[PDB]
Amino acid sequence: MGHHHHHHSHMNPDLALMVKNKGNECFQKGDYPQAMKHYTEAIKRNPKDAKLYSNRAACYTKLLEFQLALKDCEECIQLEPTFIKGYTRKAAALEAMKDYTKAMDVYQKALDLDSSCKEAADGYQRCMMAQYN
């Protein structure tokens, strides 16, 4: 069961998937800004990967750069409209714009792409209840 490979054989199938993994691990070390730049260099490896831009948008909330979290998502839908968790972060951004009504539409759209994204359904209760105080 010895995995045979040569000295010029890539054990990594796609380095562009490996740079995004360590991007997510950087964030996991308790980091945000450098983690965004690890996603940005992951974007230099896979620009069409829209769910990779979703992580940038998710950080911009914490940094009060919601404007960037929006505009990154406006083009992200043009790159790959099936970026599911970016809808979850986008709607959380709309919540900060008091657009709870627009937010719940975008959580519905996260569940619409694939309902396995039920994490967005918890975020839905968060945005709907906010106006129903």
UniProtKB/Swiss-Prot annotation:
Membrane-spanning residues = none
Give the highest taxon in the source lineage: Eukaryota
One GO BP: cellular response to interleukin-7
Quote a single Gene Ontology cellular component term. protein-containing complex
> Where would you find this protein in the cell?
Cytoplasm; Nucleus; Dynein axonemal particle
Q: Where are the TPR repeats?
A: 16-49, 50-83, 84-117
Q: Give UniProt keywords alphabetically.
A: Acetylation, Cytoplasm, Isopeptide bond, Nucleus, Phosphoprotein, Repeat, TPR repeat, Ubl conjugation
Q: What is its main location?
A: cytoplasm
Query: Would I find rRNA processing among this entry's keywords?
Result: no
What quaternary arrangement does the UniProt entry report? Probably forms a complex composed of chaperones HSP90 and HSP70, co-chaperones STIP1/HOP, CDC37, PPP5C, PTGES3/p23, TSC1 and client protein TSC2. Forms a complex with HSPA8/HSC70, HSPCA/HSP-86 and HSPCB/HSP-84. Interacts with PACRG. Interacts with EEF1AKMT3. Interacts with HSP90/HSP90AA1; the interaction dissociates the PPP5C:HSP90AA1 interaction. Interacts with FLCN, FNIP1 and FNIP2. Interacts with HSPA8/HSC70. Interacts with HSP90AB1; upon SMYD2-dependent HSP90AB1 methylation.
Q: Report the protein's function.
A: Acts as a co-chaperone for HSP90AA1. Mediates the association of the molecular chaperones HSPA8/HSC70 and HSP90.
Q: What is this protein called?
A: Stress-induced-phosphoprotein 1
Native organism: Homo sapiens
Entire protein: shown range: 356 to 477 of 543
